[PDB]
Design an enzyme around this catalytic site. Structure first.
Site, short mmCIF file in Angstrom:
data_model
loop_
_atom_site.label_atom_id
_atom_site.label_comp_id
_atom_site.label_asym_id
_atom_site.label_seq_id
_atom_site.Cartn_x
_atom_site.Cartn_y
_atom_site.Cartn_z
N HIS A 115 0.79 2.17 -2.60
CA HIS A 115 -0.43 2.78 -2.10
C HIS A 115 -1.65 2.69 -3.03
O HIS A 115 -2.35 3.66 -3.37
CB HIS A 115 -0.36 4.28 -1.70
CG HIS A 115 0.28 4.60 -0.38
ND1 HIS A 115 1.51 5.22 -0.23
CD2 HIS A 115 -0.23 4.33 0.87
CE1 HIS A 115 1.70 5.37 1.07
NE2 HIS A 115 0.68 4.86 1.77
N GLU B 92 -7.29 -5.87 3.31
CA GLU B 92 -5.92 -5.49 3.24
C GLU B 92 -5.28 -5.68 4.62
O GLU B 92 -5.90 -5.69 5.65
CB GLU B 92 -5.74 -4.04 2.79
CG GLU B 92 -6.51 -3.14 3.73
CD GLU B 92 -6.13 -1.69 3.52
OE1 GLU B 92 -4.99 -1.21 3.70
OE2 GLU B 92 -7.00 -0.87 3.13
#
EC number: 3.1.27.-
Length: 108
Positions: A100, A71
């Site tokens: 999220h 990420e």
């Protein structure tokens, strides 16, 4: 200067690494980044968090043996981190999350 969705997305598939304005959580902490004070831009000007392993605990991302997920943050300039990330695999599959890591959508 590369922190947009397409910019980093194209960059990874190509240069096979993140742009130079990215550092991991640990490099950032060594430099003085304190998550609770949203001070990243003060200790690491022009930098965004990216490159740490994303475990994909909830099997939400497509698994494959030999495949790892990473990420990077997206649209970060200063303050507390936002909720937007780019998820990239060892084989260069690119996804985005804007909530999220709750929901994910393919972008490349």
């Amino acid at each position: 200067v590369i922190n947009t969705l397409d910019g980093v997305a194209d960059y990874l598939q190509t240069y096979h690494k993140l742009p130079d304005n990215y550092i991991t959580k640990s490099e950032a902490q060594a430099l003085g980044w304190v998550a609770s004070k949203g001070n990243l831009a003060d200790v690491a000007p022009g930098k965004s968090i990216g490159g740490d392993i994303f475990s994909n605990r909830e099997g939400k991302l497509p698994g494959k043996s030999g495949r790892t997920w990473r990420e990077a943050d997206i649209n970060y300039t200063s303050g507390f981190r936002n909720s937007d990330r780019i998820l990239y695999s060892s084989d260069w599959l690119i996804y985005k999350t804007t909530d999220h890591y709750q929901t994910f959508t393919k972008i490349r």
